[PDB]
Design a protein around this motif. Structure first.
Motif: not given
Ligand SMILES: */C=C\C(=O)N[C@H]1CCN(c2ccc(C(N)=O)c(Nc3ccc(C(=O)NC(C)(C)C)cc3)n2)C1
Length: 252
Positions: A86-90, A135-144
């Motif tokens: 979110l912060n990266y996009l902004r 490297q600019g790769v987005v990963k999903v966190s806090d799943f569940g």
């Protein structure tokens, strides 16, 4: 120590990100989340951590272990040096191309296809819960993780969740569509002029987000498909991945 347990004596704390960056056994980068007393259903979380240890995908932030013998307990994960999506996009300095935005969508979709193959729901997918590495790769966190919390994400929830609390794979699909909208809007708050209450009314009346200016028609079609009023008419993550790859091939 069980195989899910890290000895906190092996950690070196390097800076604040409560979440900290550190090293494990002098060499391996980690993020260290300190779980505030009373905030989490800890014994339930520990049991689930054992399962989470076995989830492994390149686009899923890896859980390395937990430190549970003292309080606060620690959650040890893969370090993501560029922080929350979110912060990266902004940050306007990045001057993102749409191909970069589409790749962020693909990264998340691949993680979610993996979770779906394991019948694991995220339950709170949103740009604020994705991270970005060096490297600019987005990963999903806090799943569940929301299941163990003792601010509801109205703006990422489908009608059946808002009306009936019906969570399913299709509620994660709906959230993914909102996440694409967040990416293509450079981090705008969904329904930015509305309160949560007004958003729930809007959705229930069958109204929707509309097209971000950076989204092509074909990209808008993909995010919009996640918002079908009928859960069973929404795509799977596997279908979404195929749609995203097709646009990457067409818009290359
Ligand atoms: C947008 C939501 C948000 O700010 N979330 C914070 C709470 C959890 N956070 C978190 C969790 C895990 C990691 C990790 N696995 O590395 C990180 N990493 C992180 C956060 C911030 C920064 C940072 O501030 N970078 C800049 C360039 C200084 C902005 C780097 C790494 N964070 C964060």
């Amino acid at each position: 120590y069980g195989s899910w347990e890290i000895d906190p004596k092996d950690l070196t704390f390097l800076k604040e990100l409560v979440v900290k960056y550190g090293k494990w056994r002098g060499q391996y980068d980690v993020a260290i989340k300190m779980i505030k007393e009373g905030s989490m259903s800890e014994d339930e979380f520990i049991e689930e951590a054992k399962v989470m240890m076995n989830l492994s995908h390149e686009k899923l932030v890896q859980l390395y272990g937990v430190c549970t013998k003292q309080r606060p307990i620690f959650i040890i994960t893969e370090y993501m040096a560029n922080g929350c999506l979110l912060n990266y996009l902004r940050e306007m300095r990045h001057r993102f191309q749409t191909q970069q935005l589409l790749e962020m969508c693909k990264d998340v979709c691949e993680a979610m296809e993996y979770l779906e193959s394991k019948q694991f729901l995220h339950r709170d997918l949103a740009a604020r819960n994705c991270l970005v590495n060096d490297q600019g790769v987005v990963k999903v966190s806090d799943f569940g993780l929301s299941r163990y919390v003792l601010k509801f994400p109205v703006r990422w929830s489908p009608p059946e969740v808002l009306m009936y609390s019906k969570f399913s794979s299709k509620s994660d699909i709906w959230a993914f569509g909102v996440l694409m909208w967040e990416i293509y809007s450079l981090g705008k708050m969904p329904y930015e002029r509305f309160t949560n209450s007004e958003t729930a009314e809007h959705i229930a009346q069958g109204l929707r987000l509309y097209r971000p200016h950076l989204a092509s028609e074909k990209v808008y079609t993909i995010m919009y498909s996640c918002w079908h009023e009928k859960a069973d008419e929404r795509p799977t993550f596997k279908i979404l991945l195929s749609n995203i790859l097709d646009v990457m091939d067409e818009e290359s």
